[PDB]
Design a protein around this motif. Sequence first.
Motif, PDB file in Angstrom:
ATOM      1  N   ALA A   1       0.821  -1.205   0.000  1.00  0.00           N
ATOM      2  CA  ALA A   1       0.000   0.000   0.000  1.00  0.00           C
ATOM      3  C   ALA A   1       0.854   1.253   0.000  1.00  0.00           C
ATOM      4  CB  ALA A   1      -0.916   0.009   1.202  1.00  0.00           C
ATOM      5  N   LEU A   2       0.398   2.263  -0.750  1.00  0.00           N
ATOM      6  CA  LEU A   2       0.903   3.623  -0.646  1.00  0.00           C
ATOM      7  C   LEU A   2       0.169   4.333   0.470  1.00  0.00           C
ATOM      8  CD1 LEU A   2       1.019   4.714  -4.409  1.00  0.00           C
ATOM      9  CD2 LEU A   2       2.516   3.137  -3.139  1.00  0.00           C
ATOM     10  N   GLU A   3       0.915   5.024   1.343  1.00  0.00           N
ATOM     11  CA  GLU A   3       0.371   5.910   2.370  1.00  0.00           C
ATOM     12  C   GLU A   3       0.485   7.364   1.918  1.00  0.00           C
ATOM     13  OE1 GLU A   3       2.495   6.854   6.252  1.00  0.00           O
ATOM     14  OE2 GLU A   3       0.890   5.518   6.965  1.00  0.00           O
ATOM     15  N   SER A   4      -0.642   8.090   1.931  1.00  0.00           N
ATOM     16  CA  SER A   4      -0.663   9.532   1.686  1.00  0.00           C
ATOM     17  C   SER A   4      -1.286  10.271   2.855  1.00  0.00           C
ATOM     18  CB  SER A   4      -1.415   9.881   0.402  1.00  0.00           C
ATOM     19  OG  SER A   4      -1.385  11.282   0.170  1.00  0.00           O
ATOM     20  N   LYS A   5      -0.603  11.332   3.300  1.00  0.00           N
ATOM     21  CA  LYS A   5      -0.983  12.088   4.487  1.00  0.00           C
ATOM     22  C   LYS A   5      -1.880  13.283   4.197  1.00  0.00           C
ATOM     23  CE  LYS A   5       2.756  10.533   7.338  1.00  0.00           C
ATOM     24  NZ  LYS A   5       4.043  10.894   7.975  1.00  0.00           N
TER      25      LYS A   5
ATOM     26  N   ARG B   1      -8.135  13.017   9.392  1.00  0.00           N
ATOM     27  CA  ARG B   1      -6.760  13.574   9.525  1.00  0.00           C
ATOM     28  C   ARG B   1      -5.702  12.466   9.459  1.00  0.00           C
ATOM     29  NH1 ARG B   1      -7.491  17.540  14.767  1.00  0.00           N
ATOM     30  NH2 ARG B   1      -8.333  19.358  13.657  1.00  0.00           N
ATOM     31  N   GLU B   2      -6.098  11.207   9.625  1.00  0.00           N
ATOM     32  CA  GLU B   2      -5.175  10.094   9.469  1.00  0.00           C
ATOM     33  C   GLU B   2      -4.884   9.930   7.983  1.00  0.00           C
ATOM     34  OE1 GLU B   2      -4.315   8.048  12.454  1.00  0.00           O
ATOM     35  OE2 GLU B   2      -6.336   7.149  12.937  1.00  0.00           O
ATOM     36  N   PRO B   3      -3.813   9.207   7.599  1.00  0.00           N
ATOM     37  CA  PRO B   3      -3.517   9.003   6.184  1.00  0.00           C
ATOM     38  C   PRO B   3      -4.628   8.207   5.489  1.00  0.00           C
ATOM     39  CG  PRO B   3      -1.637   8.383   7.575  1.00  0.00           C
ATOM     40  CD  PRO B   3      -2.827   8.566   8.483  1.00  0.00           C
ATOM     41  N   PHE B   4      -4.603   8.178   4.154  1.00  0.00           N
ATOM     42  CA  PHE B   4      -5.384   7.227   3.371  1.00  0.00           C
ATOM     43  C   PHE B   4      -4.389   6.358   2.598  1.00  0.00           C
ATOM     44  CE2 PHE B   4      -5.040   8.908  -0.918  1.00  0.00           C
ATOM     45  CZ  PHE B   4      -4.639  10.214  -0.699  1.00  0.00           C
ATOM     46  N   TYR B   5      -4.866   5.208   2.118  1.00  0.00           N
ATOM     47  CA  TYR B   5      -4.024   4.158   1.487  1.00  0.00           C
ATOM     48  C   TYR B   5      -4.548   3.829   0.088  1.00  0.00           C
ATOM     49  CZ  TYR B   5      -2.110   4.095   6.159  1.00  0.00           C
ATOM     50  OH  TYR B   5      -1.545   4.462   7.342  1.00  0.00           O
ATOM     51  N   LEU B   6      -3.620   3.464  -0.797  1.00  0.00           N
ATOM     52  CA  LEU B   6      -3.908   3.027  -2.147  1.00  0.00           C
ATOM     53  C   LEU B   6      -3.237   1.687  -2.315  1.00  0.00           C
ATOM     54  CD1 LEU B   6      -3.179   6.465  -3.739  1.00  0.00           C
ATOM     55  CD2 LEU B   6      -5.352   5.273  -3.950  1.00  0.00           C
ATOM     56  N   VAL B   7      -3.996   0.714  -2.822  1.00  0.00           N
ATOM     57  CA  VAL B   7      -3.501  -0.636  -3.053  1.00  0.00           C
ATOM     58  C   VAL B   7      -3.649  -0.949  -4.534  1.00  0.00           C
ATOM     59  CG1 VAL B   7      -4.160  -1.312  -0.709  1.00  0.00           C
ATOM     60  CG2 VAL B   7      -5.686  -1.882  -2.649  1.00  0.00           C
ATOM     61  N   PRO B   8      -2.791  -1.793  -5.147  1.00  0.00           N
ATOM     62  CA  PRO B   8      -2.965  -2.152  -6.562  1.00  0.00           C
ATOM     63  C   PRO B   8      -4.315  -2.803  -6.906  1.00  0.00           C
ATOM     64  CG  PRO B   8      -0.831  -2.950  -5.711  1.00  0.00           C
ATOM     65  CD  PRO B   8      -1.620  -2.440  -4.527  1.00  0.00           C
ATOM     66  N   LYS B   9      -5.078  -2.259  -7.861  1.00  0.00           N
ATOM     67  CA  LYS B   9      -6.251  -2.930  -8.445  1.00  0.00           C
ATOM     68  C   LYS B   9      -5.897  -4.298  -9.072  1.00  0.00           C
ATOM     69  CE  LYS B   9      -9.774  -2.474 -12.068  1.00  0.00           C
ATOM     70  NZ  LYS B   9      -9.718  -2.178 -13.533  1.00  0.00           N
ATOM     71  N   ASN B  10      -4.935  -4.308 -10.001  1.00  0.00           N
ATOM     72  CA  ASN B  10      -4.370  -5.545 -10.545  1.00  0.00           C
ATOM     73  C   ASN B  10      -5.405  -6.553 -11.059  1.00  0.00           C
ATOM     74  OD1 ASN B  10      -1.988  -7.264 -11.154  1.00  0.00           O
ATOM     75  ND2 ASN B  10      -2.679  -8.530  -9.423  1.00  0.00           N
ATOM     76  N   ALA B  11      -6.365  -6.051 -11.842  1.00  0.00           N
ATOM     77  CA  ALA B  11      -7.304  -6.857 -12.622  1.00  0.00           C
ATOM     78  C   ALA B  11      -6.710  -7.065 -14.007  1.00  0.00           C
ATOM     79  CB  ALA B  11      -8.637  -6.141 -12.740  1.00  0.00           C
TER      80      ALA B  11
END
Lengths: 348, 356
Positions: B161-165, B192-202
Motif C-alpha cells: 500500500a501507498l500511504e498519503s498524508k 486527519r489520518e492518512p489514506f491508502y492506495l492498493v494495486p487494483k491488478n485486474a
Amino acid sequence: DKLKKVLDKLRLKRKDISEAAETVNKVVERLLRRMQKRESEFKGVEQLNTGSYYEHVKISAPNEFDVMFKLEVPRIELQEYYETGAFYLVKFPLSHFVLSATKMLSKFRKIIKEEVKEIKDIDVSVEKEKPGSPAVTLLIRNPEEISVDIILALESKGSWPISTKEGLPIQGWLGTKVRTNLRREPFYLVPKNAKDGNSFQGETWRLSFSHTEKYILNNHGIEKTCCESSGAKCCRKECLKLMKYLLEQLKKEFQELDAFCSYHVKTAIFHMWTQDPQDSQWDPRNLSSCFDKLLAFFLECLRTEKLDHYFIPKFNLFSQELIDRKSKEFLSKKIEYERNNGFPIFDK
Amino acid sequence: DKLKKVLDKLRLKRKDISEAAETVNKVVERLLRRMQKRESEFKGVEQLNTGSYYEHVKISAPNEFDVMFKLEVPRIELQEYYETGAFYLVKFKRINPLSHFLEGEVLSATKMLSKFRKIIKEEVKEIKDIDVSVEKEKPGSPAVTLLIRNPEEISVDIILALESKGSWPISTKEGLPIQGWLGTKVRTNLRREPFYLVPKNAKDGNSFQGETWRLSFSHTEKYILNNHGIEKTCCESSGAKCCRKECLKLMKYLLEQLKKEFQELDAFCSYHVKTAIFHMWTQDPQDSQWDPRNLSSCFDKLLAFFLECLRTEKLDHYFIPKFNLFSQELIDRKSKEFLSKKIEYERNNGFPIFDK
DNA sequence: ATCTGTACATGTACAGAT
DNA sequence: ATCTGTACATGTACAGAT
DNA sequence: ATCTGTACATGTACAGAT
DNA sequence: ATCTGTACATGTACAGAT
Ligand SMILES: Nc1nc2c(ncn2[C@@H]2O[C@H](COP(=O)(O)OP(=O)(O)OP(=O)(O)O)[C@@H](O)[C@H]2OP(=O)(O)OC[C@H]2O[C@@H](n3cnc4c(=O)[nH]cnc43)[C@H](O)[C@@H]2O)c(=O)[nH]1
Ligand SMILES: Nc1nc2c(ncn2[C@@H]2O[C@H](COP(=O)(O)OP(=O)(O)OP(=O)(O)O)[C@@H](O)[C@H]2OP(=O)(O)OC[C@H]2O[C@@H](n3cnc4c(=O)[nH]cnc43)[C@H](O)[C@@H]2O)c(=O)[nH]1
Ligand SMILES: [Mg+2]
Ligand SMILES: [Mg+2]
Ligand SMILES: [Zn+2]
Ligand SMILES: [Zn+2]
C-alpha cells in the motif's frame, strides 16, 4: 428560567472575545519568541493554553487567560515531598538552577519583565510577585483590564507518579480506553511550592493536569456526541458556570472566603460528573435540579471536610491543615442561605 | 439460545491463536526486515495489521491474517479513473527509489507489485523453519498470499500500500456518515489520518489497467470495530456489553457457509457484509438497539437490510458513497437473486446451515 | 565522545479459559 | 467473577555509526 | 526547527419557523 | 419561549514548504 437569564448575563460577547484575544495573543507570541533566542535556558519552551477561557467556561468577560510555557526535561527523577501527593523535588542547559523551582521561576520572571519593558504598543505591566505562586501575571489595559497568567512548567514523558495511580476515576463515565490514553500523555510540574514558612519550599514543584482537565471539559459526555452538532446538548458546563459565579460573588463580599477558589468548584464537579455519568442526568430541561444537586454535593464536601484532588486521591483540598472548619461552616451557611432564598446574590 | 451456541462454535481457541500467531509473526517479521535491506525500493515500509483477526471478528479458526506493508509516498497527485470514486492513477510532481516503476509520470501498480512479489518469493524460499509457500497470483488482487502448514493450513495476505498524508480524496467527502453515532470529533480525527492506495491488478483489459490503484480504509475500519459504540464504555470492563460484533460474526458465517457450497456465490465476499453492517450501525446508532438479549432480532434486522440491498441492487461503499458494490456491472441480478432466496430460506427455516 | 535506528520495556484492553 | 495470552501504543537503552 | 494554510470544533448572534 | 440555519469569530492539530 431564572438560571437561564443568569447564564445570559454570564455569556461572553463575540466582540469582547475578539478584542481581548488579539491583544493577549500579541503579547504572548512576543514573550514566547523571546524565550527561544540566544542561550536562553528556556529555549524549546512550547505553548499550551489552559483554564476557563480555553475550556469555554469563562464567565462575565474575557479578562483572565492562563497560558503554560512548558519545557521538556531529560532524565528527571522525582521524590515526593513528605507524602503530600502533589508536591515533589526534582533531580537529574538548565545547569545554573536539585532543580530549584524559585531559582528557575526567578529567571523566567526576569526575562518576561524585560520583554514587557520593551513593549511600546500595548499598555501592559507585570504584577508584583505573590510568594509561592507559580505564575508571572501580566496586567493589560485594552483599555479594559485583562490579566494573563504565564505558568512555567516542566514536561515529563514518563509514567505518571504513583500518587496518581488511583486518580482520574473515569472508567464508568469516559472509560478505560480514554483513561489509558490520557495517562500516556506527559505530566507537568509547576513551580508552586507554598510560602508556608514550613517546609523545604523553594525547591518544591506541584503536579499539573491542566491539559487533562481541558480534554475532559471538551469531551465530557458518556455519549461521544454530547454537545456536538449531531448530538444532544447537556447542561454540565452551565452548572459549572453557575457554581463558579456563586463562589465569585460570595468571595467579593466576604473576606472569610479567601481560602476558597474556582479549582475547588472544578474539582467538586469532576466528582459529580463521575458520580452521575449519564448525559440524561444532565438534561438542559433539568438545569435547576442539576444545579441544586451540585450545591448539595459541595455542601457535603464542606461538612465532611473532604474534597480529594481528582488526580491525586490522597490530597484533600479541604483538609483541616489547608482551610479551618470555621471557614467551611461560614461558606456552608452562605450557600445554604442563597439556596433557600432564590439566589439573591445573582441579582445585579 | 441457538445463536449463543452458534457463537460458541464460532469462538476461537486461545491454544489455536497462540500457535498460529507465533508462526505468522515470525514469517511477517522476516519479510518486513528483508524489505528494509540493501537498495530495496520498499525500504521504509511499515507494518499495519488489518482485517477480521485484528478486529476480533475472525470466526471458526485463526487461519486467515491480513497485513498491510505501507510505504509513505510524499508529493503525489491523484487522478480519479473515470468517476468510479474508488480507483485512481498516481503521478508525481517531481521527476528516488520508485523511479524504476514510472511510466512517464505514472506509477505502475503492477510493476511495483511484481517487484514486491519477487522479493517476497525469494525470502520465503530461504525460510527453513516452517512449511511456507507463496500462493499462485490471483488477478484482481493487491495481495501476495502465503500458505503456511503449521501443520494446520493458515493463509497470510500481504498487501502493498501507498500511504498519503494529505486530505482524503473528494469522492469521500460525504462518506463515513458517523456524525450521529461516533460523532463529529471522531470523524474529523479519523479523516486527519492518512489514506491508502492498493494495486487494483485486474486483467479486465480496460485502458490504464496495470497502473490503477484502489483506496483502502482498513485502518479506519479497524478503529470503528474497536470503538463501535455511541457510549464510550460500550463493551468495556465498566460498561455494558453490546451484540454488534456478534451480529457481524453470524452474518460472516452465513455467507462463508453458503460460499463453500455454492459456486453461484463467487462474486460475494465478507466485505459486502462488513459494509452492510456499517450502514446498519449508522442507522441504529444507540447501544440499546444492540442489546445482547436482542441478538435474534438484531441479526434478523441485518438480514432484512442485506436482502433489501440485494433486491434493489444497491450497497454503497461506506467511505465512497458513489461506488455501488452491488451495481449490475459488478454482480449480475442472477447472483443477487440466488443469494436472496438462500438467505430468505435459512431465515424462515431456523438457519439449517448453522448446524453444519 | 555523541547520535541514532532498532529492539526491548512497560502498561492495559479485549476476550478466552478457569 | 478471576486469571492469562496477544496485540498494540509509547517510552527508553544501546550497539553501531558519526 | 519554524511558519503558513486548511479544516473544523467550540462559541456567539439573530431571523424565521415551531 | 425553543429550535433550526446561517453568519461570523476564535482555537487547535498537523501537513507540507522553508
Ligand atoms: N489551576 C489550578 N489552580 C489551583 C490549584 N490549586 C489551587 N488553585 C487555585 O485555584 C485558582 C484557579 O485559577 P485558574 O487556574 O485561573 O482557574 P480557571 O482558569 O480554571 O478558572 P477561572 O477561575 O475562571 O480563572 C487559583 O486561585 C489557584 O491558586 P494557585 O496559587 O494554585 O495559582 C495561582 C495562579 O497560578 C496559575 N496556576 C496554578 N497552578 C496551575 C496549573 O496547574 N496550571 C495552570 N495554571 C496554574 C493559575 O493561573 C492561577 O490563577 C491547582 O492544582 N490548579
Ligand atoms: N478488505 C477489502 N476486501 C475487499 C474490498 N473489495 C472487495 N474485497 C474482497 O473482500 C474479501 C475481504 O477479505 P479480508 O480482507 O480477509 O476480510 P476480513 O479480514 O475483514 O474478513 P475475513 O473474511 O474473516 O478474512 C476479499 O475476498 C477481497 O477480494 P480481493 O480480490 O479484492 O482481495 C483479496 C484479499 O486482498 C486483501 N485486500 C483487498 N483489498 C484490501 C484492502 O483495501 N486492504 C487490505 N487488504 C485488502 C485481503 O487480504 C483479501 O483477502 C475492499 O475494499 N476491502
Ligand atoms: Mg483562570
Ligand atoms: Mg481476513
Ligand atoms: Zn455535553
Ligand atoms: Zn459494544
